[PDB]
Amino acid sequence: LEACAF
Amino acid sequence: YTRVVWCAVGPEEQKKCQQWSQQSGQNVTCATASTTDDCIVLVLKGEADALNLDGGYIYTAGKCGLVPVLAENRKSSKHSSLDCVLRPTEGYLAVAVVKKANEGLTWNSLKDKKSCHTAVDRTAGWNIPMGLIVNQTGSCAFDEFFSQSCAPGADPKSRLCALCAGDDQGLDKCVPNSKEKYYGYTGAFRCLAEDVGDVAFVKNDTVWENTNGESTADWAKNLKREDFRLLCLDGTRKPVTEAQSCHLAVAPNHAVVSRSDRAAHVEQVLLHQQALFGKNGKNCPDKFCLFKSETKNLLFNDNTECLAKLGGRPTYEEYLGTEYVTAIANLKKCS
Ligand SMILES: *[C@@H]1O[C@H](CO)[C@@H](O[C@@H]2O[C@H](CO)[C@@H](O)[C@H](O)[C@H]2NC(C)=O)[C@H](O)[C@H]1NC(C)=O
Ligand SMILES: *[C@@H]1O[C@H](CO)[C@@H](O[C@@H]2O[C@H](CO)[C@@H](O)[C@H](O)[C@H]2NC(C)=O)[C@H](O)[C@H]1NC(C)=O
Ligand SMILES: *[C@@H]1O[C@H](CO)[C@@H](O)[C@H](O)[C@H]1NC(C)=O
Ligand SMILES: N=NC(=O)c1ccncc1
Ligand SMILES: [Fe+3]
Ligand SMILES: [Zn+2]
Ligand SMILES: [Zn+2]
Numbered sequence: 117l118e119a120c121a122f
Numbered sequence: 123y124t125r126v127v128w129c130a131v132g133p134e135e136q137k138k139c140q141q142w143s144q145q146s147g148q149n150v151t152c153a154t155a156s157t158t159d160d161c162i163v164l165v166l167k168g169e170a171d172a173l174n175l176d177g178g179y180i181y182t183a184g185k186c187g188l189v190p191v192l193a194e195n196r197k198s199s200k201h202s203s204l205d206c207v208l209r210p211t212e213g214y215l216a217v218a219v220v221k222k223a224n225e226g227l228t229w230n231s232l233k234d235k236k237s238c239h240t241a242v243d244r245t246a247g248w249n250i251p252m253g254l255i256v257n258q259t260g261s262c263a264f265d266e267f268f269s270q271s272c273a274p275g276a277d278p279k280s281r282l283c284a285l286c287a288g289d290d291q292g293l294d295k296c297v298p299n300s301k302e303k304y305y306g307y308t309g310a311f312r313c314l315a316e317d318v319g320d321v322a323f324v325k326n327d328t329v330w331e332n333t334n335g336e337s338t339a340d341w342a343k344n345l346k347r348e349d350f351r352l353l354c355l356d357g358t359r360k361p362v363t364e365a366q367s368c369h370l371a372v373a374p375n376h377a378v379v380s381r382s383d384r385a386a387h388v389e390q391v392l393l394h395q396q397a398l399f400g401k402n403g404k405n406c407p408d409k410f411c412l413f414k415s416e417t418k419n420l421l422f423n424d425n426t427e428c429l430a431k432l433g434g435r436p437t438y439e440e441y442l443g444t445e446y447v448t449a450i451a452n453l454k455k456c457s
Contacts, residue, residue: 117451120186122163 129161129170130154132299145410172380177245184438192429193377206428215326215369216246218353235320237268238313242275245373251323253453262456274298326365
C-alpha cells in the first residue's frame with residue numbers, strides 16, 4: 117500500500 | 123484551452139470516442155488502449171488526459187497520482203431542485219444475482235458454483251464479492267472458490283476465465299474490454315441470463331436495465347425480473363426490487379480521473395462537453411449523446427444523467443471512502 121503499481 | 127485527449131478502452135469505445143471527437147470539433151480527441159490499466163498508463167505518460175473509471179481503478183490510478191475530476195451522477199433517488207452537476211452522488215448498490223429457478227442457491231452455498239464478474243479489480247464485480255468471500259473463508263485462494271468463472275482480466279487459461287467467451291470470432295477470450303461478450307456489468311449479467319454462470323456480481327441498476335423490455339438486445343429482450351433473485355449476506359434471497367435491503371455494499375460512483383496536472387482543464391472541457399452532449403444537452407439526441415451507446419456502457423454508463431462536480435476537492439481515498447479503501451487494501455494482500 118504505497119507504490120504506484122506500474 | 124487546449125484539446126483533451128480521452129482514452130478509449132477497446133475498439134467500440136474508440137469508435138464512440140471518435141464520433142464524439144468529430145462532434146466536438148477536435149476539442150476532444152482520442153487515444154485508445156486494450157485495457158483500462160493500459161489507459162491509466164497512457165495518462166501517466168501524458169499521452170492521454172483522462173477517462174472514466176470504476177472505483178477499483180480509481181484506487182489503482184490514485185496510487186499513481188491520478189485524481190477524481192467529476193463523478194457519474196444518475197437518476198437521483200430523492201427529489202432535488204439541485205442541478206444534477208451540483209448534486210452529491212449517492213453511490214450504486216453492488217449485488218449478487220442468481221436465477222430464481224436455481225432454487226438451492228444462497229450466499230452461503232456459493233462454493234463450487236459458476237461465477238460471472240464484470241472484470242478483475244472492479245468494485246461490484248470483483249473487489250466487493252471476493253473481499254467478502256476471502257474474509258468469510260479465511261483464505262486468499264479466491265482463484266479456487268468458484269469451480270469456474272468469467273472474470274475478464276484473469277489468466278485466460280485459468281478457471282477464472284473458463285466461462286468467458288471472447289468476441290465474434292472467439293478471439294480475445296477474457297480480455298477486459300467490451301470485445302469480451304461477458305465483460306462489464308451487462309456482459310456479466312448476460313453470462314447469468316444465458317445460464318453460463320450460477321451468479322453474477324453486478325450492480326442493482328444492471329438487472330433493471332436489461333430486463334422487462336428495458337433492453338431490446340436479443341439476449342435480454344425476453345428476460346423478466348421475477349426470474350431473478352438477489353443474494354443477501356444473511357443467507358436469504360429476495361426479489362430484485364429489494365436491493366436496498368439485500369446488497370453486498372454501496373459502491374462509489376465511477377468518476378473521470380486525470381493527471382492532477384490537467385485536472386482543472388479536463389474539468390473545464392467536460393462541463394462544456396456535457397452541456398453539448400449530455401442529457402438534454404444542446405446536441406443530444408440530434409447530433410450525439412455522450413451518455414448513450416445502447417446499453418453497452420461505452421466511455422460512460424448509459425444511465426448517467428450527468429457528470430457532477432465533487433464537493434470538497436477530494437483525494438482518491440476520500441472519494442472512495444476509507445471503508446472501501448481498506449477493503450481493497452486487504453484483498454490485495456492476497457496477491
Ligand atoms: C435499482 O435500479 C433501478 C434502475 O436504475 C432503479 O430505478 C430507476 O429509479 C429511478 C429513480 O429512482 C426511476 O425513475 C426509474 O424508473 C428506475 N428505472 C427503471 C428502469 O425502472 C431502482 O430504484 C434501483 N433500486 C434501488 C434500491 O436503488
Ligand atoms: C475484510 O476484513 C478486513 C479486516 O478484518 C476489513 O478491513 C477492516 O475494516 C474495518 C472496517 O472498515 C476497519 O476499521 C479496519 O481497520 C480494517 N482492518 C484491517 C485489518 O485492515 C475489511 O472491511 C473486510 N473486507 C470487506 C470488503 O469487507
Ligand atoms: C471548442 O472549444 C472552444 C474553446 O473553449 C469553444 O468555444 C467551442 O464551443 C468548442 N466547440 C465545440 C463544438 O466543442
Ligand atoms: N464517492 N462517493 C460516493 O459515490 C458514495 C459512496 C458512499 N455513499 C454514498 C456515495
Ligand atoms: Fe463499477
Ligand atoms: Zn448497505
Ligand atoms: Zn479533502
